[PDB]
Structures are given as structure tokens and as C-alpha cells.
Amino acid sequence: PYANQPTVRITELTDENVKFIIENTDLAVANSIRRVFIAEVPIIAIDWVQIDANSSVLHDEFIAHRLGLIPLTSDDIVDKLQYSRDCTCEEFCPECSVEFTLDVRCNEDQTRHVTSRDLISNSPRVIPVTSDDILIVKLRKGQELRLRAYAKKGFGKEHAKWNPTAGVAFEYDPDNALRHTVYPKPEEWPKSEYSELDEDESQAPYDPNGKPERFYYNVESCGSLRPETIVLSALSGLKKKLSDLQTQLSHEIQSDV
């Protein structure tokens, strides 16, 4: 009637993906942390744009949208920023925001690319991912653009611009030892990357008293957080949800009298 002792084992580690393996756990826990890499990891992104002069080809709400999806370096200072709805300041302050600024004017005849190298911030900790360049708009001789933006903090249930990860692979039981899925003709199916079968076999023999273990992960990253702090910030975020719900519960069955 108690918990398990899971064991982790990392296989790869780059600046854009992690491959690891979690043995000796339950399927519901190995999935509930697959949905947290996506939804509930906080990150910085632009959420307030105001345009002073836009004489380009794209209308105002086109450029205000291509800006929010630019990823900003959210490595270390996400833990020091309040949610703008919790902070005791006014609409904006340097405790819950970061201000950007763009101002470009095309004068030569050759066309001009307005990349993300033009987003100039005030805090040297949060800059777009440049240390190529994302394209925002192209300008012709006689056109210009200038605006001001603030970058708040949130996670991926608000909007899909706040999630920190590209595709998150996940799979278990590379051979149908459990027959969770049923092949009609088990010979036409390619063998999985993690399989341990022979070259002339299709499935492992069925065993009825089995249970799914040894889940395989592969977490990529878009560029904001390192691929190994996406995981550490997820487990530390899921733990703090249960730990807060246990407060509300004991506060209920205590006020029962």
C-alpha cells in the first residue's frame, strides 16, 4: 500500500534533446509527467504589443502574432518573476515583465529583412534565441515599423506559445509481450528501435501476469530552456500541485466539526 522506487538512466544528452529511461513505476505516473513537459512548465513570451507606425504589407494583427511565437531565453530568471495577476504593482513593472523595442526604417532601394536581431530589450537575461535569425517582415524603400512589447510569464494551458518543447516522444513495451495492441498480420510491421527480438521474429511470446514497466522518453526543446531543466522543472512543478491540494483537503476534513 505504498509507493515505488523508480530508477532513471540517461542515454543521450545534447543541447536540444534528452533520452532517458524510467524503470519500476506505474503507467499512470509515467504519463502524467508526459503531459507536464507540455502544459505546465512556465516560460517567458511576449503578450502585449502596441504599434506606433506600421506601413508594411502585413496588417497590425499579423505582426502582433508573429512576435508572440518568438522564443525568449527563459533559463534562470523565471523563478524570480511573479505572475502579473499576483504582483502588487500596477499593469506593469520590472518585477513581472520585460520590455522590448523595435524600430526599423528602409531607405536603400534593395529590400530589407526585419529579423529578430532587432528586438532590443532592457534586461540582458531575456533575449531572443541569438547568441540564424527568425524573419518577421520584409520592407520596401519608403516603409517603416516601430512598436513596444512586454513579455509576461505563463504556461502552456493559456496559449501554445508558452510551451517549451517540440515533439515529446514516449513509448513502452516495444514488443507485444502484453498484447496491448493486436496485429492482424504481425509480419508486415517494422521492428521498433528499442526491440530485443531476433531478425526473424515478430512478437515476444504472450505472458498473462505482466505489467508495463521501463518507459522510454525523448524530450526535445525549442530553445528557451535547456533540455535537462525542462524535466527538473516539471517534476518540481507536479509535486507542488499535490502538495497544495493536500492543504485544501486537510483544511476541509478539519472544519468538518
Partner 1 sequence: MIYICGECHTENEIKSRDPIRCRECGYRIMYKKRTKRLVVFDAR
Partner 2 sequence: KRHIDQLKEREYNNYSWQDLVASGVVEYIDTLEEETVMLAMTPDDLQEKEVAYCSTYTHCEIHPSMILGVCASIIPFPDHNQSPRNTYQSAMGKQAMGVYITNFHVRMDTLAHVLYYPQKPLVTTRSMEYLRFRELPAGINSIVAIASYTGYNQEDSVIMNRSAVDRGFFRSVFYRSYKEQESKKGFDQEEVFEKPTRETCQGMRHAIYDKLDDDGLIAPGVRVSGDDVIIGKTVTLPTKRDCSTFLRTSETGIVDQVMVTLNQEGYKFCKIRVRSVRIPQIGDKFASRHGQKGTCGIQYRQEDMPFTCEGITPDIIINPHAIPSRMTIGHLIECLQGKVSANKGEIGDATPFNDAVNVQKISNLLSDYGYHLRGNEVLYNGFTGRKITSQIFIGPTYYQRLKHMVDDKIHSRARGPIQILNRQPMEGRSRDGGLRFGEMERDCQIAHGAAQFLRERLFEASDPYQVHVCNLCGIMA
Partner 3 sequence: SLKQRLKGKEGRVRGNLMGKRVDFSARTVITPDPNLSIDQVGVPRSIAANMTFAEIVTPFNIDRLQELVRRGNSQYPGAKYIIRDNGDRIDLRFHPKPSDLHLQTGYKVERHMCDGDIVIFNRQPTLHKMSMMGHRVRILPWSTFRLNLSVTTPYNADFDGDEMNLHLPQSLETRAEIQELAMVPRMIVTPQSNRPVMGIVQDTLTAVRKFTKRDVFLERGEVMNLLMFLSTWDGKVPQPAILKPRPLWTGKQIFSLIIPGHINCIRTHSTHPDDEDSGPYKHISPGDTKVVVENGELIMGILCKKSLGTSAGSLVHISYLEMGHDITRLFYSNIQTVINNWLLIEGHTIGIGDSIADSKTYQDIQNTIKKAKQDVIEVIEKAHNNELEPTPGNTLRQTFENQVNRILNDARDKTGSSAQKSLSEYNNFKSMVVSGAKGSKINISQVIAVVGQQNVEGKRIPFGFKHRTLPHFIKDDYGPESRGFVENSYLAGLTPTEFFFHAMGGREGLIDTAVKTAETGYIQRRLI
Residues in touch with partner 1 (CB under 8 A): 45-53, 60-61, 64-65, 67-69, 149, 158-159, 161
Angstrom distance (rounded) from CA 215 to CA 218: 10
Question: Is residue 1 at the binding interface for partner 3, with CB under 8 A as the rule?
Answer: no
Closest approach, Cβ 180 to partner 3, in A, equals 10
Closest approach, Cβ 83 to partner 3, in A, equals 24
One character per residue 180-219, x = contact with partner 3 (rule: CB under 8 A):
----x-----------------------xx----------
- With CB under 5 to 8 Å by kind, the binding choice for 93 among Zn ion, partner 3, partner 1, none is Zn ion
Where the chain is discontinuous (C–N > 2.5 Å), the residues before each break are: 131
Question: Is there a contact between 103 and 146 (Cβ–Cβ < 8 Å)?
Answer: yes
Question: Is there a contact between 36 and 237 (Cβ–Cβ < 8 Å)?
Answer: yes
Specify which residues 223 forms β-bridges with.
Answer: none
Question: Is there a contact between 190 and 139 (Cβ–Cβ < 8 Å)?
Answer: no
Nearer to partner 1, 23 or 60 (CB): 60
CB-based burial, 224-250: b 16+ in 10 Å, e otherwise: bbbbbbbbebbeebbeeeeeeeeeeee
Residue 106 labelled as part of a binding site: no
Q: Indicate the burial class of 131 (C-beta count within 10 angstroms; 0-12, 13-18, 19 or more).
A: exposed
Question: Is residue 141 at the binding interface for partner 2, with CB under 8 A as the rule?
Answer: no
Nearer to partner 1, 47 or 173 (CB): 47
Residue 93 labelled as part of a binding site: yes
Residue 90 main-chain phi, psi, to 5 deg? -80, -160
Angstrom distance (rounded) from CA 257 to CA 251: 11
Question: Is residue 92 at the binding interface for partner 2, with CB under 8 A as the rule?
Answer: no
Angstrom distance (rounded) from CA 87 to CA 81: 9
Residue whose C-alpha cell is 518507459 = 215
Which parts of 85-104 interact with Zn ion (CB under 5 A)?
A: 89, 92-93, 96
Residues making up the binding site: 87, 89-91, 93-94, 96
Residues that bind partner 2 (CB under 8 A): 27-28, 30-31, 34-35, 38-39, 51, 57, 59-62, 69, 159-161, 163, 167-173, 176, 180-184, 188-190, 192-193, 212, 218
Residues that bind partner 3 (CB under 8 A): 184, 208-209
